[PDB]
Structure formats: structure tokens, C-alpha cells
Amino acid sequence: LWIARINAASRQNGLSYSRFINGLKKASIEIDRKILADIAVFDKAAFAVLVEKAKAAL
Amino acid sequence: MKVRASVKKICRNCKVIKRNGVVRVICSEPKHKQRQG
Amino acid sequence: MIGLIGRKVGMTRVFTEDGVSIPVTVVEVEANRVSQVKTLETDGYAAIQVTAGAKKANRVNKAEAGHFAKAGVEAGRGLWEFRLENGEEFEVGSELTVELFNETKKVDVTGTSKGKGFQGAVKRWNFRTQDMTHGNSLSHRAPGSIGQCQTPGRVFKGKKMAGHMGAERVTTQNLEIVRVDAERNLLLIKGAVPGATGGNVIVKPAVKA
Amino acid sequence: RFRPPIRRPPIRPPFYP
Amino acid sequence: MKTFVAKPETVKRDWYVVDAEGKTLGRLASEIASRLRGKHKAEYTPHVDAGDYIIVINAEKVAVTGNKAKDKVYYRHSEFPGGLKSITFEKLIDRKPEMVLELAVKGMLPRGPLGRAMYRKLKVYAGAEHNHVAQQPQVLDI
Amino acid sequence: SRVAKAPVAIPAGVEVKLNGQEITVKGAKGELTRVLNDAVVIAQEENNLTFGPKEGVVNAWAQAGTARALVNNMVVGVTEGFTKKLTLKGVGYRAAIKGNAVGLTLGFSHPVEHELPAGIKAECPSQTEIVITGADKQLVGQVAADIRSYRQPEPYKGKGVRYADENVRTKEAKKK
RNA sequence: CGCCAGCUAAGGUCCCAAAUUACUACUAAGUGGGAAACGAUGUGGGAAGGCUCAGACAGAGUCGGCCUGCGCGGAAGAUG
RNA sequence: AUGUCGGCUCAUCACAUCCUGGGGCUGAAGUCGGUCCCAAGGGUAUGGCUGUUCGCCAUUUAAAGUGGUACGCGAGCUGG
RNA sequence: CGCUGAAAGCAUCUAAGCGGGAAGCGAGCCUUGAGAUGAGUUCUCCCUGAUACUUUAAGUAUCCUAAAGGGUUGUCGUAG
Ligand SMILES: [Zn+2]
Numbered sequence: 001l002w003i004a005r006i007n008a009a010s011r012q013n014g015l016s017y018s019r020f021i022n023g024l025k026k027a028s029i030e031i032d033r034k035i036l037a038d039i040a041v042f043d044k045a046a047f048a049v050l051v052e053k054a055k056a057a058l
Numbered sequence: 059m060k061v062r063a064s065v066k067k068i069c070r071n072c073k074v075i076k077r078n079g080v081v082r083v084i085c086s087e088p089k090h091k092q093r094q095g
Numbered sequence: 096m097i098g099l100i101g102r103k104v105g106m107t108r109v110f111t112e113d114g115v116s117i118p119v120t121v122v123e124v125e126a127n128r129v130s131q132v133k134t135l136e137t138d139g140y141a142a143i144q145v146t147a148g149a150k151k152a153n154r155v156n157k158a159e160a161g162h163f164a165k166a167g168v169e170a171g172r173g174l175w176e177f178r179l180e181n182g183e184e185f186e187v188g189s190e191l192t193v194e195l196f197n198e199t200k201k202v203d204v205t206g207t208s209k210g211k212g213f214q215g216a217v218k219r220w221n222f223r224t225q226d227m228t229h230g231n232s233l234s235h236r237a238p239g240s241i242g243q244c245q246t247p248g249r250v251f252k253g254k255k256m257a258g259h260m261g262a263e264r265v266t267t268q269n270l271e272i273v274r275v276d277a278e279r280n281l282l283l284i285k286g287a288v289p290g291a292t293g294g295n296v297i298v299k300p301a302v303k304a
Numbered sequence: 305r306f307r308p309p310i311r312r313p314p315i316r317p318p319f320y321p
Numbered sequence: 322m323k324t325f326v327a328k329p330e331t332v333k334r335d336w337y338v339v340d341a342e343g344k345t346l347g348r349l350a351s352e353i354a355s356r357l358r359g360k361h362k363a364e365y366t367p368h369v370d371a372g373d374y375i376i377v378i379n380a381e382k383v384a385v386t387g388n389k390a391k392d393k394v395y396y397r398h399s400e401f402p403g404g405l406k407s408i409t410f411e412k413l414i415d416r417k418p419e420m421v422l423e424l425a426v427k428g429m430l431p432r433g434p435l436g437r438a439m440y441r442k443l444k445v446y447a448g449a450e451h452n453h454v455a456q457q458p459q460v461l462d463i
Numbered sequence: 464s465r466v467a468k469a470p471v472a473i474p475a476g477v478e479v480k481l482n483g484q485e486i487t488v489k490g491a492k493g494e495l496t497r498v499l500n501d502a503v504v505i506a507q508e509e510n511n512l513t514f515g516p517k518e519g520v521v522n523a524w525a526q527a528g529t530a531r532a533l534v535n536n537m538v539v540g541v542t543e544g545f546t547k548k549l550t551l552k553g554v555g556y557r558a559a560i561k562g563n564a565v566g567l568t569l570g571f572s573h574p575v576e577h578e579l580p581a582g583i584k585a586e587c588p589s590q591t592e593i594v595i596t597g598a599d600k601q602l603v604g605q606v607a608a609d610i611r612s613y614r615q616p617e618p619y620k621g622k623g624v625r626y627a628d629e630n631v632r633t634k635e636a637k638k639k
Numbered sequence: 640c641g642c643c644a645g646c647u648a649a650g651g652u653c654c655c656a657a658a659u660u661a662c663u664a665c666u667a668a669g670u671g672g673g674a675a676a677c678g679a680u681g682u683g684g685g686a687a688g689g690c691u692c693a694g695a696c697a698g699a700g701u702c703g704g705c706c707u708g709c710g711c712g713g714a715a716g717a718u719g
Numbered sequence: 720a721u722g723u724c725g726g727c728u729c730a731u732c733a734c735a736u737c738c739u740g741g742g743g744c745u746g747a748a749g750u751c752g753g754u755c756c757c758a759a760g761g762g763u764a765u766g767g768c769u770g771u772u773c774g775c776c777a778u779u780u781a782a783a784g785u786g787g788u789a790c791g792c793g794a795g796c797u798g799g
Numbered sequence: 800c801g802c803u804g805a806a807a808g809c810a811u812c813u814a815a816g817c818g819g820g821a822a823g824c825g826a827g828c829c830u831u832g833a834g835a836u837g838a839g840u841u842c843u844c845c846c847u848g849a850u851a852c853u854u855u856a857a858g859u860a861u862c863c864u865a866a867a868g869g870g871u872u873g874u875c876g877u878a879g
Contacts, residue, residue, distance in 0.1 A: 001324060001365075001366075001367065001643090001657095002324065002643085003657060003658075004360065004365055004656095004657070004658095005363050005364075005365055006363075007657090007658080008360065008361055008362050008363045008365055009363040011361070012361075012363070016658090016659065016660070017657095017658065017659095018652080018658060018659055018660080019659085019660080021658095030645085032643095032644055032645075033644085033645090034324070034643055034644070035644095037324065037363075038324070038325065040363040041325045041363050041364060042325070044363070047363075059742090059743040059744065059755070059756065060743090060744075060755075061743095061755065061756060062678085062713090063676090063677065063678060063712075063713040063714095064677060064678045064679090064713085065678065065679070065712090066678065066679080073810075073811080074679065074680070075680085075810095075811060075812095075813095076679075076680080076681075076711085076712095076813095077811085077812065077813065078812085078813070079668090079681095079711070079712080080711095080712075081678070081679045081711080081712065084811080086632075088743085088744065088745090089744065089745080091743075091744075093712095093743095093756090094678095094712065094713075094756095095678055095679050095711090095712060095713085130842095131841085131842065133840095133841070133842090137840095137841070137842095138840065138841050138842095139840065139841090140840095144842090156843090156844075156867080156868075157843080157844045157845075157867060157868085158842090158843050158844040158845085158867075158868085159843075159844085160843080160844080161842085161843040161844055162842055162843045162844085163843090164843085165842075165843070166842095205829095209877060209878095210877085210878055210879075212878085212879060213879085216729090222728080222729075223727090223728065223729090224728090225727065225728055225795090225796060225797090226727070226728095226796080226797075229727095229797075230796080230797050230798075231727090231796055231797070232796065232797080233796085234728085234795060234796045234797090235796090237728075237729095237795055237796070238728075238729065238795075239727080239728030239729035239730080239792080239795060239796080240728065240729045240730065240791080240792035240795060240796095241729065241730085241792085241795075242729085242730075242731085242791080242792070243718095243729095243730070243731060243732095243788055243789095243791040243792060244788070244789050244791055244792065245721095245788090245789055245791095246718070246787095246788055246789080246791080247718045247731080247732095247788080248718095249718090251401070251402040251718080251730090251731065252399075252400055252401045252402070252404075253401050253402070254729090254730085254731095255729080255730095259879090261878095262878065262879090263830075263831095264829090264830065264831090265829085265830085266828090266829060266830090268828080268829085290877085291877035292877070293877075294877080302827095302828065303828070306723095306724085306790080308723070308724070309722090309723050310723080311720080311721085311722045311723045312720085312722045312723075313720095316722095322643075323643065324643055347653080347654085348653070350653095350654075351653045351654040351655095352653085352654085353654095354653095354654050354655080355653090355654065358654090358655095360654090386667095386669095387667070387668095387669065388667085388668095388669085389669075392669075393669090396719080398718095398719050400719090402718070402730095402731055402732075403718085403719090403731080403732070404719080405719055407824090408825085412825075415825095416825085425654095426654090428654080428655075429653090429654040429655055430654080430655070431654095431655060431656090432655080436655085441837085464805085464806070464807075464808090465697095465699095465807085465808045466805065466806095466807095466808065467805085469808080497816090498816095499815085500815050500816090502815085503815090522805095522806065522814065522815090524805085524806065525805050525806035525807090525814060525815085526805075526806085526814080526815060527805085527806095528804085528805040528806065528807090529803095529804050529805040529806085529814085529815060529816085530805085530815085531805080532803090532804065532805065533803080533804075533805090533815090533816090536803080536804090599803090600802090600803065601802055601803040601804090601816085601817065601818095602802085602803090602817095603802090603803095604801095604802045604803060605801085605802045605803080605817075605818065606802095607802090608800095608801060608802055608818085608819090609801095609802095609818085609819080612800080612801080612819075615800090617748095618747090619747090619748055620748085634747090635748090636747085636748040636749090637745090637746055637747075637748080638746090
């Protein structure tokens with residue numbers, strides 16, 4: 001469920017789930033899918049930040 | 059018409075043609091006409 | 096096609112001068128009056144609705160009575176609709192008479208068949224009876240098998256069985272008109288017409304002509 | 305080939321004891 | 322603590338309008354199907370219809386590759402013996418334009434109560450017009 | 464290929480109107496129009512039309528070749544036009560032009576009458592000869608085919624509607 | 640054994656159904672997603688050969704083998 | 720404890736088509752045929768003998784198809 | 800079975816394009832049919848009162864009203 005939600009949010013911010021997780025890994029961000037998916041719902045801006053960080057790492 | 063798995067020139071005036079995905083022999087000799095090559 | 100709404104009066108014969116008897120059903124077409132014109136703009140199809148006969152005023156609902164009042168026809172025994180295909184123009188109140196079929200050689204008649212109630216497969220579907228003697232046990236008018244073992248393990252839909260017979264819309268086709276009587280508002284139609292005497296019949300020019 | 309079987313008892317219901 | 326759940330009461334469903342003209346049936350349908358579920362939203366909850374109303378116009382102009390126009394067959398069984406009915410894509414586009422896309426989407430949606438509910442939100446139209454001006458649908462390139 | 468690489472001259476008194484992929488050739492004998500395949504590139508170099516393949520398209524040369532020959536037939540059509548000549552053989556077989564229709568007696572109990580299409584014009588030099596003429600080589604061919612189809616030449620006495628050219632292989636009937 | 644944490648295996652990543660994009664080819668047969676002998680100017684690649692501007696093949700190429708990729712026909716069953 | 724042959728009743732499907740429809744070839748003049756291709760919409764004997772299915776016979780018919788369905792159908796009949 | 804037509808200077812029903820063509824296929828005929836929950840359309844008819852109360856609703860309660868029409872009852876039917 002989380003992965004599906006994160007994928008939705010990432011793609012709204014112009015990155016695939018698969019690329020976003022790689023990005024975060026490369027950025028050394030170790031936020032779990034449970035939290036990410038919580039952020040994607042409750043703090044859309046923060047999700048976008050994380051996405052921008054992820055994009056930079058890729 | 060001869061419907062056969064093996065179609066092939068029976069004489070020198072026979073000519074093989076593919077027409078709508080079927081191999082066919084067509085010839086001046088009506089007996090030589092074939093399909094289902 | 097335009098048609099009339101008759102009442103089946105009964106059968107009779109018409110002796111021709113050449114000594115042929117003609118079995119005729121007599122349909123009485125009391126003047127039909129257009130009660131509503133349906134158009135493509137209002138209703139999405141072209142039809143006339145017609146009434147026929149009279150209904151006791153007391154027997155007419157307010158909803159019914161307003162519909163007739165709008166046409167400025169008197170209430171009739173029911174309402175029947177005829178699709179128009181020819182771009183034919185009718186107005187409300189316009190009468191249709193037996194004289195419609197003055198040129199028509201053959202008509203198609205439609206009524207409700209007489210009701211035979213619950214009938215078995217033998218009468219309903221012309222099932223053969225089984226043996227009346229020679230051992231038959233309680234299974235003389237029985238319908239037989241109704242299927243075919245494990246495959247398919249069920250009775251197929253539309254299997255001919257006992258059930259209600261009759262009391263159904265039926266149309267006979269290509270019934271000749273023997274005589275139009277405009278005075279008495281009669282059509283004499285060769286042969287049989289669905290349903291019992293007194294039943295409503297719709298008469299229409301034959302579609303297969 | 306079809307070998308004619310003996311599937312049922314020789315005395316048939318309702319008498320089958 | 323608990324993962325968020327979309328609430329049938331609260332879920333915001335947006336109207337969109339898609340032009341089918343010149344679009345690969347299947348590729349179009351897969352996108353529409355995901356939007357009807359609401360897979361495109363972070364609030365995507367499997368047990369809730371948080372999807373979006375999709376209007377499709379020019380459904381009769383939906384495209385198909387290969388010889389699929391003449392060879393794609395739609396089957397229906399009446400449940401009467403020998404009650405199988407076939408129609409080809411081309412013939413179904415003539416008879417009932419809209420069915421082609423609707424069938425496509427229907428297959429791609431989940432089976433059961435909710436999936437039937439999702440499909441209800443698809444409003445397919447053969448022409449270029451639709452009766453849902455009041456819903457103010459946004460154009461969507463899908 | 465070869466056929467494409469050969470350009471089509473535009474004789475003086477032919478008014479070719481290229482509309483991208485469409486080519487309305489016009490001339491004395493009429494106005495023929497045709498949209499070529501997208502795969503075909505057409506160009507008007509001088510008083511010649513030149514045919515060649517679109518870049519990257521499979522069977523573009525083949526498409527280019529047909530388009531050449533199509534246009535060529537258009538040009539011949541509007542200047543000279545095409546004529547096909549049917550010949551009737553068989554006792555009591557006769558044709559006669561009645562209006563815009565070739566009436567044929569072909570030994571059928573019903574009377575046979577074939578309405579010429581728009582742009583086609585049939586004559587009857589004799590009762591036993593017909594001449595279908597027009598600008599569109601395909602229409603002409605179609606019409607002569609249709610008329611021939613009423614009673615195609617039998618193989619025992621040759622009887623029926625044949626092309627004046629057509630050679631009708633004649634078998635004799637099985638001995639006895 | 641518990642956990643609304645993370646990584647992977649086989650298998651996967653259009654939608655049902657969690658997850659992919661880019662690029663290079665080939666296939667047009669829904670091949671993929673049943674079936675052989677054999678048949679066939681289907682089409683892609685490779686390495687040679689014969690014949691030809693002293694004119695080939697039917698005024699420039701053309702013919703036939705070989706090694707190979709992918710396709711075609713051959714291909715009829717019973718409730719849907 | 721899944722009743723087993725044949726009949727009767729009632730069927731339903733396949734198509735490898737018996738008839739009827741459309742075709743090609745014919746050693747197809749015509750009238751008929753043969754053979755192959757398309758086609759499963761509808762139609763597709765009654766009797767004599769035998770428990771028979773079958774078969775033979777008589778006389779029909781446009782034709783008297785070939786199969787699958789617990790060699791369809793005994794909580795539907797029969798029981799030779 | 801073609802017409803026109805290249806690939807393949809020819810040829811070629813086919814690759815682009817345009818035809819003919821079956822008792823079969825979709826309509827056409829008859830019947831059912833909006834539980835077609837996607838529950839359609841049209842025509843006509845009927846109901847235009849008070850109050851309090853609350854955690855204010857498509858609220859509750861009381862009073863007054865009881866329409867169009869539907870039923871039950873009755874005489875019956877070629878309907879059962
Ligand atoms: Zn030959």
C-alpha cells in the first residue's frame with residue numbers, strides 16, 4: 001500500500017517509485033516506506049523536497 | 059483447384075504467387091492451379 | 096405502418112358467385128381517433144397514438160382523462176401506438192377508418208391468443224406421448240428425459256416443458272381482405288385471427304408485401 | 305472390449321433385502 | 322501509527338475529459354483504469370473509490386494496431402444452448418461505438434462491488450460532446 | 464523502382480495540380496484525381512513528374528513504383544483515354560447500347576442490361592462487338608470485366624462475351 | 640513467537656496486481672500465446688561465386704547456391 | 720454400491736457435409752456424375768426378420784450424414 | 800472470380816487502391832424486453848397545513864390533513 005502511495009506521490013513530483021528509492025538510497029536517506037507514504041499524504045511539500053533530493057542523487 | 063500442403067510448379071508455365079497469405083500456383087493449364095502451399 | 100384497432104366480432108363465410116366459401120373473421124373497426132402524435136423532436140421517434148371505442152366516463156382516471164382532453168378526443172377503450180415511417184403527418188383528433196384498407200390486398204392481424212392455462216409438453220410443444228400400454232408406469236404423457244447426464248449436468252435454457260400456453264400476442268401474416276364495409280365499419284378478413292371474439296385486434300398492411 | 309458387467313443385485317428394490 | 326485511509330465521505334473525485342481520437346484502445350484503457358481506481362493519488366486506498374470521473378469523447382475514433390480492426394472479436398454467450406455471439410471490433414464500432422472502450426476498461430478494473438462502482442465513474446461518448454458541462458471537466462491528455 | 468525511376472512527362476495541355484499527396488491531373492478527355500501513399504514523394508521537376516520513396520519507409524520503392532504507373536495512366540487517360548473491346552460469340556447473342564446501358568442478349572430468359580458508370584462510354588460497332596472507353600483505365604477495365612462476367616467464354620465452342628484480344632483455349636468434348 | 644521496519648531468491652515491473660525506464664535490433668504472424676514431414680519470390684544478417692556498359696537480367700545491374708535470425712502454410716471436435 | 724445392453728421419450732453439441740446453397744478442376748457437350756474447397760441455417764424413411772445395436776431385405780426420400788454428450792437420457796418409461 | 804497495380808522494365812486479384820461473391824453472418828419478420836441498478840422516454844393527473852423540540856438533520860414529536868390513485872370486499876370472465 002505504502003509503495004503504491006509513494007509511487008503516486010513521486011510520479012506527481014516527476015519521478016518513478018523505482019527511481020525515487022534509488023535516489024534516496026544514493027542520498028543516504030533511510031526513511032521507511034511507512035513514513036514516506038505517511039509524508040506523501042500528510043505533508044506533500046516535504047515529500048517534494050525528498051523527491052528533489054532523490055533526483056539530485058540520481 | 060488442387061489444395062495441397064505441397065504446391066509447386068507442375069510445368070514451365072506455372073507461377074508461384076502469395077496472395078492474401080496463401081501460396082498459390084497459377085498457370086495457363088487450369089489443371090495446374092493450386093493453393094495452400 | 097399505420098393500422099386500425101378493431102374488435103373481433105366472430106367468424107363467418109362469404110359465398111362467392113363461383114360457389115367458393117370463404118372463411119372470414121369479421122373485425123369491427125369503430126372509428127380510431129389520434130390521441131397523441133409522437134415526433135422525433137419530442138419523443139425520438141415518429142408515431143401516432145390512437146384510441147378506439149368508448150370508456151364509461153366513471154371508468155376513466157384523471158390521468159387518463161387529461162391525456163384525452165389534451166387531444167380533444169373522447170376517451171376510448173384503450174390506447175395503441177402506430178409508428179410512422181413514411182414521414183406521414185397526422186394531427187390529434189384525426190380519425191382513421193376501415194377505408195384505409197380500400198387498396199390493401201393483404202393485412203397482418205395481431206391479437207392476444209386464447210389462453211389454455213397450464214398445459215403439458217404434449218399439447219404445448221407437440222411432444223409425443225409414451226406407450227399407453229406395454230408396461231408404461233405412470234409415464235404416459237411424461238415429457239421424457241430433460242437432459243444428458245454429468246455433462247452438462249444441468250437443464251439447458253429454453254428446454255421445452257409444461258407451462259402456461261396461450262394468452263400471448265400473436266400476429267398472423269398476409270391475411271387477405273375479402274371486403275371493406277365503410278357503412279358498418281367492418282373488415283372481412285379471410286381466415287383466422289388471434290384470440291376470442293370481443294378481443295382487440297390490430298390490423299396493419301402486410302409487412303411482407 | 306465391452307465385458308457385460310453385474311453392477312446391481314439380481315433382486316431389485318423395493319424387495320431388495 | 323496507522324496507515325491513512327481514504328474515507329468514502331471525504332474522498333475528492335475530480336471530473337476529467339479525455340479525447341479517445343487516435344489513441345491505442347488498450348494503452349488508453351490502462352490509463353483510464355488506473356485513474357478510475359485512483360492509483361494516481363497518494364490517498365489511494367484499495368477498499369475505497371478515491372478515483373476520478375473520466376469522460377471519454379470520440380470513443381468511435383479509438384485506434385487499434387495490426388489487423389485487430391477486422392480480427393479482434395468480442396464474444397457473448399446468451400446462456401442458451403449454442404448461444405455464443407461474436408462481433409468484430411470494426412462491427413462493434415459501427416453498432417455500439419462506446420462498448421469497445423468500456424469493455425476495455427471493464428477488464429482492467431477489479432472484479433466485485435468496488436470495481437463495479439469505479440466503472441460507474443466512466444462516462445464514454447461516441448461524439449465530441451458530453452452532457453457533463455456542469456461538472457466542469459478538466460482536459461486530460463491520457 | 465525501375466518504373467518509379469522513369470519520370471512521367473506532362474504533355475502540353477495536361478494541367479497537373481499537386482496538392483501534396485493528391486494529384487489532380489486534368490486534360491482534354493477529363494479530370495482524374497488520386498491521393499498517393501504517404502510513403503511516396505512526388506515532385507514537379509520541369510514538365511516532368513518524378514516518383515521516389517519517403518525516407519525510412521518499408522516498401523516505399525514499391526509504393527513509389529505503383530504511384531508512377533498510376534499517374535502515368537492518369538496522364539494517358541486525360542489525353543488519349545483507354546478503350547476495351549468486348550466481342551460476343553454465339554447464336555442469338557447480340558448487344559445494343561440503350562441510353563447509358565449496354566443491353567446484351569446472352570441466351571438468358573431474363574433480359575440483361577448493364578448501366579455504364581459515370582465517365583464511361585460504350586459503343587456497339589456491331590451487335591456482336593462492344594467498345595467501352597474512358598479516361599480511368601481501372602473503371603474501363605472494371606466495366607468490360609462486368610459485361611464479360613454475364614457470360615464468360617465457355618471452353619467447348621468459345622461462346623459468350625470475350626475480350627477481342629482474349630484467347631479462349633478450346634477443348635473438344637470427351638469421346639463418346 | 641510478536642512488529643503498520645529493511646534487503647534479497649525464484650519470479651517479475653501497461654491495467655487487473657507490488658515494481659522500469661533508456662537504447663539497439665528483429666517479427667507483422669496476435670507469431671509471441673499448441674502440432675511434423677514437406678511446401679513457399681515472407682523478411683533480416685553473413686561469407687563467397689557466376690554473368691555483365693565488348694551490353695548482363697526481363698542500358699544497369701542480374702542469377703543461383705551456402706552459413707544463419709525471425710516468421711507463413713501444412714493446422715479438423717464435440718456445453719461457451 | 721458411479722445400474723450395465725437395446726428400445727421409448729426428450730434431446731444438445733462437433734463438423735471429418737448426407738440433402739439443400741456457393742465455388743475450382745474434370746478423362747465437365749447437354750442431362751448426369753467424379754473429385755476437391757467454402758458452408759453446421761434448416762432438414763435428414765417407414766416397414767419385414769432378430770432382445771439386438773448392427774445387418775440383410777421391401778418400399779420410400781431432396782437426403783435417409785459421421786461422431787461427442789457416464790458407448791447422452793432407468794430418482795423419465797420399458798425390461799426383450 | 801476479378802479491376803487497376805508496383806515490389807520484380809515483364810507478369811501478378813494485393814503489397815497502396817477498387818470490385819463481384821453462399822441456404823451461412825448482422826439487419827430485415829415474429830415474441831419477450833429498462834431488475835438495460837446503465838433501472839431510459841413521452842403524455843396526463845395529484846398533494847402548495849400548523850406547531851413545538853433538539854446534540855440543526857434528507858431530524859424528531861404532536862396536531863390537522865388522507866389527494867391522484869392502489870387495495871380488500873362484491874358480481875364475474877372466451878383470464879386462471
Ligand atoms: Zn503449369
